[PDB]
Design a protein around this ligand. Structure first.
Ligand SMILES: CCCCCCCCCCCCCCCCCC(=O)OC[C@H](CO[C@@H]1O[C@H](CO[C@H]2O[C@H](CO)[C@H](O)[C@H](O)[C@H]2O)[C@H](O)[C@H](O)[C@H]1O)OC(=O)CCCCCCCCCCCCCCCCC
Ligand code: CLA
Ligand code: CLA
Ligand code: CLA
Ligand code: CLA
Ligand SMILES: CC(C)=CCC/C(C)=C/CC/C(C)=C/CC/C(C)=C/CC/C(C)=C/CC/C(C)=C/CC/C(C)=C/CC/C(C)=C/CC/C(C)=C/CC1=CC(=O)C(C)=C(C)C1=O
Ligand SMILES: CCCCCCCCCCCCCCCCCC(=O)OC[C@H](CO[C@@H]1O[C@H](CO)[C@H](O)[C@H](O)[C@H]1O)OC(=O)CCCCCCCCCCCCCCCCC
Ligand SMILES: CCCCCCCCCCCCCCCCCC(=O)OC[C@H](CO[C@@H]1O[C@H](CO)[C@H](O)[C@H](O)[C@H]1O)OC(=O)CCCCCCCCCCCCCCCCC
Ligand SMILES: CCCCCCCCCCCCCCCC(=O)OC[C@H](COP(=O)(O)OC[C@@H](O)CO)OC(=O)CCCCCCCCCCCCCCC
Ligand SMILES: CC1=C(/C=C/C(C)=C/C=C/C(C)=C/C=C/C=C(C)/C=C/C=C(C)/C=C/C2=C(C)CCCC2(C)C)C(C)(C)CCC1
Ligand SMILES: CC1=C(/C=C/C(C)=C/C=C/C(C)=C/C=C/C=C(C)/C=C/C=C(C)/C=C/C2=C(C)CCCC2(C)C)C(C)(C)CCC1
Ligand code: OEX
Ligand SMILES: [Fe+2]
Lengths: 75, 341, 30, 66, 38, 37, 167, 42, 28, 484, 34, 42
């Protein structure tokens, strides 16, 4: 099937008037609920520095990098 | 008939996107390399590896977002998600820079898979594999810059990060620390890339201005058939023009189009050789006879010695921020400045 | 003394360019 | 064309040419040997990378007996 | 000596290729001389 | 044996699964969408 | 002296963060890509006119009227390499695209140098990412800024008497 | 003071590959003159 | 069927673009 | 009318002259190895193996002779310092002369195989055309490769019928050639274990013997013969080029990172021993056990060997040279003569300051003194006006320990500043910069030069794999394609 | 059946709107230096 | 210590007149091969 005759058919726009706004909303809710900070470990604007750590947190060990990061992200 | 032959028939079937046997490698690895780069530049920080914001979640725009290299502490670790640094934790994997090695390794096998695709399609169409030979240029650039350069250095940290301004840092890091413009292998690379853009513009404009009258429209794009046998432009007139303008002209269309292949690919291959040398710090840093003369004669100034003072400014003013693991504390009294700046 | 080598290489390069232009193999049809 | 004394000793070693086993032959066995060789190279890469940590294998400069 | 070899071919280098190679060697000598002299 | 070695063997299995589930899906689609004669 | 010109220009104008230099880099990276692309597909699809002993370039005669390469075979290759709709079947439209991409790219970067002549500099994103307390979180533009600072405090080191390089 | 071996590296690195190509071009023209058959073939 | 080759790019693109559009209204 | 880049394709279907052209490459390579070793023996200085070892003198093939057992010369010296009565044939000079004699013998054999190209052995008895049975020729040459790999491992390396290989301690102080027992466990894959070298060449040699047995008896499949183009000799060139750039990336890796096959007494230290502070930590660890057993600071530091202090100096870093800084490392800083001792910097209150060492990225580095907490206490200021951590203000004094300045205190700030500048390069040595007329810029080691050549050769050989592999598969269209 | 220029109209109006939001977000919120 | 210009005088005084005679001999044989008319003439 050709391309431009698909996107001009009304059956294409019956399907994609629901699926495209539902994915756009679901991407919006991935940020609005704060889930993307917890999945990827990105700091929220509150939590670049904590009350104990006023410095920039760096990992200085290779094999305890997972445990050193858990101590830097506890607050 | 055979089970191999049924799969070989299905993979090489003429469809909208050709798959082939090489698509079993290219389409997984290139999708994860591109999709891993979009995931990192949108969501994943560099706050624990570099101390930077590098995603759109943190306020970066397209120019300043990057997938940054891992921390210097992990060395040349492969940083597998199941490996001994992340240990299956996806969140800790993204924070130690595991997406960099994800993008760089799946991107390395995507370039293998794309060059295998060029070999596979040329074997089915029945032409010569010169496009796969020309893609060895971009492969030699990626292998030598993103893999071989950090492997000769201390860690993956000194590799280029996968961003726009992060690449701009890598350009200026290698001027200050390696004097990479002075390297004659970068110079051969600049000649091949500017020579390739020149050859693109000259051959593009010479064909377009030596066209034959093949229609009555002033729009000359309609007067070409893709299956015609006649040449659409006058090679004799084009050779006559450049022989009197420039003194020298192409006379062979086969040699002309091989030369359009040869110049940028040689430029990418010669510049890949000198960046393998910078991996081991075998750099073209100093002309020692000018350094020895300027040491004992304090008016001997060239544009050469002026560039070394720029590099000593770069290496002192960026090193505390660009290598934060090293804990460089330079007081203001030791930073090299000129007067009043 | 190395400026003698630098001058000879540049002047020698321009002499090749002279012969490449005015002593070129003329493109001929048939 | 020239028959030599050493050339007659080595002559059966070049006597076959283009002699093939029919069909797919030993290609399934060759792919298994190639696959185990790929796993073997991934093992010794990751040991030396310290992505694979084995007991009593300390990848560091060692004391050869002097 | 065995027979005359049937694989013997002629070698060509036209005037264009001479000028391209003379230019390449002189320009590589121009480029790399400053580094060799150091 | 170690946690690093058991995770490595688990990745050869998981690597063989995603090679397997592509290959099994590639066999069954080459039998269904075979080329008519 | 050219490299001295480039580094001082980056410190004083941030040319790397200027989009007109970015279009120029896309002009010369794309132009040498398209040169190597167009040069590959013609050389890939040359018609048999020579033997294995002579050079392949002797299959073209200067002044011949016939096409020297199969442009259908090159279009069928590149149409399967990416997808069919992304390839030029018109050789006149293709050679026009070979002329336009580096020339417009070099035109734009020439108007980057000409507009950074009057100090309309590249993008300044220094201290633009700020956390909740107000502290500056650095970005890659800030590390680029630390390299710009190192060139500008060291360039023309005796020429300046006053704290701003307004020239 | 410059490295004294660089005079050999530049001048033999120029002359010997240049005289190799001059050698290849001259025997190409001499082979064409011999096949042409007149006054230059001998 | 050519669905999951164009939808492997288009579905994460619209998801990511919905996220980046929501990011413009995040303040510190 | 061959082009210049196709001139050597005249031996593509001439198996007698392919052997002759490979015997001449073999003659040139062996002639290089004999004459490079003779040149290196003419300029080697075997008088101070401690502070002027072979890797400070730019010796390139000399560490490869010593790695496998050649320690002595005909001149009576060894590189271990052990004076020798009569080394016999396999000295450094006798190995160089044997590579020269082998070069001349391969040269005469190349003339014969070029002249007598038309041997009946190279003809196909089925067709009469010149053919090579590359499946069985591979089975022959793989089987001999297994016998040479096994025999090198079983006899040369284990010292059954051989000298062994070079082994060393963990810090490159005492090294020797000795037989090496094979390590059959998982520690045979530890690349710093020398027993893995013996265990590899025995096991891989057995694999090469019996795969050579297999490849001698079993014909290739019909599908694999046609797919891999096993009648075309350029399919072998493509896969051999791939096998040889693979191997050159491995040798560049183990040279640059370090292995038991690349010892630091033959090739020099690596760049990672300076970054990690490898010799500095051991020098401290030896000093602290000496002050634990009732010795002073001056007596502890005098127990440090000068060979150990020489490794802890940035001029021996292979990542400190330049691409065109030509020659030995002695051409840079001079020939090392004596360790000056370990400086200890103290200010007026008395706590020890240490100069922050120069990292290998930096051609220049600011002189900065920190305490045990890393806090800046003193430096040498660029701008002197509002300087607050200058050495004249803080009053830094320097005490030396060990070396040639062993009991000596410097308190005036001019000479403390002179010693702080050399303390950022690691351990300070007295050099002789007038024998080689040294310029004052660091060169790279033979370890750094090997990695340069072989990682750039491996990159260039990757293109040759793509070219010759594409030339194999596409052989029927390399004069062009058909228009029909 | 929809005219193809009408799809490119509202498709280009969506791209203009989204890039206007990306350029608005450079002056507001995160990354705005405010 | 020897004169450093003598390395150039000996090595270019050897190689350049030797490669001139190698040039003259090779074009003599190529001219004979072109006039011979078979497989080497082209
Ligand atoms: C062309 C087409 C190619 C097609 C592209 C294919 C892409 C495939 C991707 C390949 C992935 C390879 C990367 C593996 C990471 C690696 O290398 O990782 C490097 C590790 C070595 O680890 C490093 O080793 C160093 C040496 O350490 C040693 O020294 C230290 C101080 O002495 C300590 O003692 C330490 O214990 C001891 O091990 C440091 O420790 C580093 O921190 C540590 O990261 O080696 C290892 O995994 C294995 C290294 C041996 C393999 C050699 C080949 C690869 C390397 C080529 C580069 C050589 C460098 C030349 C540069 C030019
Ligand atoms: C006759 C036997 C012989 C012996 C005993 C020697 C001995 C020596 N050679 Mg000489 N050499 C020889 C012949 C010999 N050579 C020939 C014929 C040539 C011309 C090719 C040379 C060219 C040569 C050079 C250029 C050099 C030497 C050097 C040396 C010295 C160091 C050896 C070394 O470190 O290599 C180490 C050898 C290897 C690492 C071999 C690698 C083998 C690879 C890994 C095989 C991989 C492919 C394999 C087939 C795969 C399948 C394996 C299978 C079992 C599974 C040593 C004294 C060095 C030297 O110090 O000169 C003074 C040196 O630089 N040789
Ligand atoms: C008793 C059993 C035994 C033991 C103890 C050993 C021991 C060893 N083997 Mg051996 N081996 C054996 C049997 C054994 N072998 C058998 C039966 C075979 C089959 C014939 C082999 C085949 C084999 C090969 C092919 C190799 C070894 C290697 C080694 C060494 C590994 C340590 C090292 O330095 O590698 C370092 C780690 C690697 C080389 C990892 C390999 C991954 C490669 C390098 C990836 C990169 C490839 C790519 C093309 C390069 C570009 C990438 C990027 C830069 C762009 C160690 C001495 C390695 C070696 O010789 O090292 C000097 C090696 O390459 N072995
Ligand atoms: C694998 C190859 C290899 C490697 C790693 C080494 C390594 C070494 N050599 Mg050896 N050497 C080699 C092969 C090699 N050699 C060969 C094949 C020869 C015969 C020509 C020699 C002859 C030789 C001599 C006479 C000497 C050495 C010396 C050395 C040592 C110092 C290196 C140096 O300062 O280079 C300097 C840097 C360069 C030469 C730069 C390399 C070339 C660059 C990349 C440009 C590439 C060429 C360019 C494109 C063409 C020029 C253009 C032209 C038109 C002018 C070092 C250990 C020295 C030593 O210390 O011995 C005790 C020494 O005196 N070598
Ligand atoms: C063992 C490795 C090996 C072998 C046996 C071959 C063999 C061949 N190559 Mg291949 N190739 C290789 C590696 C190899 N190549 C590598 C590493 C590359 C990437 C650089 C290539 C890229 C390549 C291309 C693009 C072409 C070939 C061609 C050829 C064929 C003719 C060569 C010729 O006549 O040139 C004659 C060479 C000269 C007249 C002078 C060349 C001078 C060079 C550039 C510098 C001097 C070299 C120096 C003295 C040696 C340094 C030693 C170093 C290699 C260790 C021949 C079959 C040609 C072909 O396919 O023919 C149909 C061809 O077009 N090769
Ligand atoms: C079942 C389960 C579990 C579900 C999981 C879902 C899943 C499997 C998802 C995976 C989906 C996935 C990602 C697959 C999609 C595959 C995919 C596309 C991945 C790759 C990733 C990626 C983003 C790729 C994009 C890269 C790309 C294609 C870039 C190319 C861009 C492009 C249009 C380039 C054209 C450039 C151009 C115009 C050049 C022409 C100019 C030029 C000089 C031509 C020369 C020339 C041309 C001729 O024409 C002819 C004639 C001649 C003479 C000639 O000279
Ligand atoms: C079967 C495969 C076995 C492996 C192939 C044979 C070994 C070849 C490997 C290279 C040679 C070994 C290095 C040289 C050793 C050396 O220094 O030599 C000399 C050494 C002893 O050398 C002595 O060394 C002393 C210590 O330095 C002193 O220097 C003495 O002067 C010196 O003479 O003796 C041997 O190792 C000789 C053995 C070499 C092999 C002899 C040829 C065997 C080949 C027969 C197989 C052919 C069968 C085909 C059937 C027909
Ligand atoms: C059918 C499927 C179609 C598949 C599409 C394929 C997906 C791959 C597309 C890759 C494009 C990557 C660009 C992402 C940029 C981004 O999202 O910016 C997203 C950022 C978001 O904007 C930033 O948002 C932050 C929010 O925290 C802050 O507010 C920043 O201040 C604000 O600038 O946009 C910009 O930076 C504005 C300019 C965007 C310019 C991008 C285009 C530049 C040219 C790239 C062209 C690539 C080719 C694409 C062709 C289509
Ligand atoms: C002011 C107006 C007059 C213009 C000034 C003249 C300048 C002309 C420069 C010609 C150089 C010739 C190159 C020789 C080579 C030669 O003569 O080639 C002539 C060649 C003719 O090719 P044909 O198609 O005839 O070749 C078919 C076969 O013979 C292929 O071998 O033309 C081209 O291939 C080259 C065209 C690009 C020309 C590139 C020029 C490179 C620029 C110069 C780079 C050096 C500058 C160094 C400065 C130190
Ligand atoms: C990492 C990872 C992963 C993931 C991956 C993937 C799957 C991803 C995907 C992703 C993706 C795939 C994404 C995408 C996105 C996209 C986007 C976001 C785009 C955008 C664009 C833009 C915005 C542009 C713009 C424009 C337009 C639109 C038009 C006009 C012009 C312009 C260019 C401006 C996984 C899971 C494997 C796991 C592991 C890791
Ligand atoms: C005949 C005879 C003989 C003799 C022998 C002889 C005497 C030999 C010698 C030999 C020799 C004496 C040889 C040598 C050789 C050398 C070589 C072969 C070299 C080469 C080189 C090259 C190749 C290089 C290049 C380069 C450069 C220059 C730079 C850098 C880069 C490169 C590395 C590439 C005898 C009596 C025994 C016996 C009988 C017979
Ligand atoms: O002249 Mn050339 O560079 Ca424009 O800024 Mn002001 O002036 Mn000078 O300083 Mn900075
Ligand atoms: Fe064209």
């Amino acid at each position: 099937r050709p391309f431009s005759d698909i996107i001009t058919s009304v059956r294409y726009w019956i399907i994609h008037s629901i699926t495209i706004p539902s994915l756009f909303v679901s991407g919006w809710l991935f940020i609005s609920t704060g889930l993307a900070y917890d999945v990827f470990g990105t700091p929220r604007p509150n939590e670049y520095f904590t009350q104990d750590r006023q410095q920039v947190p760096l990992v200085n060990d290779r094999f305890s990098a997972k445990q050193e990061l858990e101590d830097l992200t506890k607050g | 008939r055979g089970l191999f032959d049924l799969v070989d028939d299905w993979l090489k079937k003429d469809r909208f996107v050709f798959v082939g046997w090489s698509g079993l490698l290219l389409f997984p690895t290139a999708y994860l390399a591109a999709g891993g780069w979009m995931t990192g530049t949108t969501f994943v920080t560099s706050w624990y590896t570099h101390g930077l914001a590098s995603s759109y979640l943190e306020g970066c725009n397209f120019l300043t977002a990057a997938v940054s290299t891992p921390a210097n502490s992990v060395g040349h670790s492969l940083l597998l998600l199941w490996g001994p640094e992340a240990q299956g934790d996806f969140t800790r994997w993204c924070q130690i820079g595991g997406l960099w090695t994800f993008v760089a390794l799946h991107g390395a096998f995507g370039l293998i898979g794309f060059c295998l695709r060029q070999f596979e399609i040329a074997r089915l169409v029945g032409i010569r594999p010169y496009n796969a030979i020309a893609f060895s240029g971009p492969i030699a650039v990626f292998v030598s810059v993103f893999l071989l350069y950090p492997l000769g250095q201390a860690s993956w940290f000194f590799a280029p990060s996968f961003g726009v301004a992060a690449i701009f840092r890598f350009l200026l890091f290698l001027q200050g620390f390696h004097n990479w413009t002075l390297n004659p292998f970068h110079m051969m690379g600049v000649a091949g890339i500017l020579g390739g853009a020149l050859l693109c513009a000259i051959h593009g404009a010479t064909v377009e201005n030596t066209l034959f009258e093949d229609g009555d429209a002033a729009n000359t794009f309609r007067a070409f058939t893709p299956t015609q046998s006649e040449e659409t432009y006058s090679m004799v007139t084009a050779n006559r023009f450049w022989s009197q303008i420039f003194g020298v002209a192409f006379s062979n269309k086969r040699w002309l189009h091989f030369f359009m292949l040869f110049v940028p690919v040689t430029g990418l291959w010669t510049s890949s050789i000198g960046i393998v040398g910078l991996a081991l710090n075998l750099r073209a840093y100093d002309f020692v006879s000018q350094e020895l003369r300027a040491a004992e004669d304090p008016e001997f100034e060239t544009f050469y010695t002026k560039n070394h003072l720029l590099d000593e400014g770069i290496r002192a003013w960026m090193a505390a921020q660009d290598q934060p693991h090293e804990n460089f504390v330079f007081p203001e009294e030791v930073l090299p400045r000129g007067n009043a700046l | 003394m190395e400026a003698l080598v630098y001058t000879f290489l540049l002047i020698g390069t321009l002499m090749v360019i002279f012969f490449a232009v005015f002593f070129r193999e003329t493109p001929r049809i048939l | 064309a020239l028959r030599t004394r050493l050339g007659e000793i080595l002559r059966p070693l070049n006597a076959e040419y283009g002699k093939v086993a029919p069909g797919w032959g030993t290609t399934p066995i060759m792919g298994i040997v190639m696959l185990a060789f790929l796993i073997f190279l991934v093992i010794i890469l990751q040991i030396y990378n310290s992505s694979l940590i084995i007991e009593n294998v300390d990848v560091d400069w060692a004391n050869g007996i002097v | 000596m065995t027979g005359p070899n049937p694989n013997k071919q002629a070698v060509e280098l036209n005037r264009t290729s001479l000028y391209w190679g003379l230019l390449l060697i002189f320009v590589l000598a121009v480029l790399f001389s400053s580094y060799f002299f150091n | 044996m170690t946690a690093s070695l058991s995770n490595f063997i688990a990745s050869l299995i998981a690597g063989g699964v995603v090679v397997g589930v592509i290959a099994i899906a590639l066999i069954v689609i080459s039998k269904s969408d075979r080329i008519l004669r | 002296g050219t490299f001295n010109f480039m580094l001082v220009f980056q410190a004083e104008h941030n040319i790397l963060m200027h989009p007109f230099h970015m279009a120029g880099v896309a002009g010369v990276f794309g132009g040498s890509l398209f040169s190597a692309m167009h040069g590959s597909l013609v050389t890939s699809s040359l018609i048999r006119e020579t033997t294995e002993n002579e050079s392949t370039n002797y299959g073209y005669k200067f002044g011949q009227e016939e096409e020297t390469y199969n442009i259908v075979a090159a279009h069928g290759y590149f149409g399967r390499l990416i997808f069919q709709y992304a390839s030029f079947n018109n050789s006149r439209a293709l050679h026009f695209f070979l002329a336009l991409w580096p020339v417009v790219g070099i035109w734009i970067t020439s108007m980057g140098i000409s507009t950074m002549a009057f100090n309309l500099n590249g993008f300044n994103f220094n201290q633009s990412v700020v956390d909740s307390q107000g502290r500056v979180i650095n970005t890659w533009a800030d590390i680029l800024n630390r390299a710009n600072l190192g060139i500008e405090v060291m360039h023309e080191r005796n020429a300046h008497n006053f704290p701003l390089d307004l020239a | 003071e410059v490295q004294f071996g660089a005079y050999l590296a530049v001048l033999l690195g120029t002359f010997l590959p240049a005289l190799f190509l001059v050698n290849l071009f001259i025997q190409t023209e001499a082979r064409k003159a011999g096949k042409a058959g007149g006054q230059d073939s001998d | 069927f050519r669905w999951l080759a164009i939808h492997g790019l288009a579905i994460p693109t619209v998801f990511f673009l919905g996220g980046i559009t929501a990011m413009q209204f995040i303040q510190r | 009318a061959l082009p210049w880049y196709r001139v050597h394709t005249v031996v593509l279907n001439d198996p007698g002259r392919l052997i002759a052209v490979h015997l001449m490459h073999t003659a040139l390579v062996a002639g290089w190895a004999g004459s490079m070793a003779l040149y290196e023996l003419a300029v080697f200085d075997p008088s101070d193996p401690v502070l002027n070892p072979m890797w400070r003198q730019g010796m390139f093939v000399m560490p490869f002779m010593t790695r496998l057992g050649i320690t002595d010369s005909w001149g009576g010296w060894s590189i271990t310092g052990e004076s020798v009565s009569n080394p016999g044939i396999w000295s450094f000079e006798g190995v160089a002369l044997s590579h020269i004699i082998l070069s001349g013998m391969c040269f005469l054999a190349a003339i014969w195989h070029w002249v007598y190209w038309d041997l009946e052995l190279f003809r196909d008895p089925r067709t009469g055309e010149p053919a090579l049975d590359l499946p069985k020729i591979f089975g022959i040459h793989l089987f001999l490769s297994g016998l040479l790999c096994f025999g090198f491992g079983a006899f040369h390396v284990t010292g059954l019928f051989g000298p062994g290989i070079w082994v060393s301690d963990a810090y490159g102080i005492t090294g020797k050639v000795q037989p090496v027992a094979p390590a059959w466990g998982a520690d045979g894959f530890n690349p710093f274990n020398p027993g893995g070298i013996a265990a590899h060449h025995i096991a891989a040699g057995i694999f090469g013997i019996f795969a050579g047995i297999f490849h001698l008896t079993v014909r290739p499949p019909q599908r694999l013969y046609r797919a891999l183009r096993m009648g075309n000799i350029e399919t072998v060139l493509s896969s051999s080029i791939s096998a040889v750039f693979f191997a050159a990336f491995v040798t560049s890796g183990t040279m640059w990172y370090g292995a038991a096959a690349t010892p630091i007494e033959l090739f020099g230290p690596t760049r990672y021993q300076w970054d990690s502070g490898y010799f500095q930590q051991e020098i401290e660890r030896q000093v602290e056990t000496s002050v634990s057993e009732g010795l002073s600071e001056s007596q502890a530091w005098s127990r440090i060997p000068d060979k150990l202090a020489f490794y802890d100096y940035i001029g021996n870093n292979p990542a400190k040279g330049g691409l065109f800084r030509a020659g030995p490392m002695n051409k840079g800083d001079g020939i090392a003569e004596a360790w000056l001792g370990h400086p200890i910097f103290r200010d007026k209150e008395g706590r020890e300051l240490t100069v922050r060492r120069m990292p290998a990225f930096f051609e220049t580095f600011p002189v900065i003194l920190v305490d045990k907490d890393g806090i800046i206490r003193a430096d040498i200021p660029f701008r002197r006006a509002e300087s607050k951590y200058s050495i004249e203000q803080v009053g830094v004094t320097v005490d030396f320990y060990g070396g040639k300045l062993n009991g000596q205190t410097f308190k005036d700030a001019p000479t403390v500043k002179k010693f702080a500048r050399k303390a950022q390069l690691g351990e300070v040595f007295e050099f002789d910069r007038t024998s080689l007329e040294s310029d004052g810029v660091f060169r790279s080691s033979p370890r750094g030069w090997y990695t340069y050549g072989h990682a750039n050769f491996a990159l260039l050989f990757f293109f040759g794999h793509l070219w010759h592999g594409g030339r194999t598969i596409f052989r029927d269209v390399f004069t062009g394609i058909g228009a029909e | 059946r929809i005219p193809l220029w009408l799809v490119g109209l509202v498709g280009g109006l969506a791209v203009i709107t989204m890039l206007s939001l990306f350029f608005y977000g450079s002056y507001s919120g995160l990354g705005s230096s405010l």
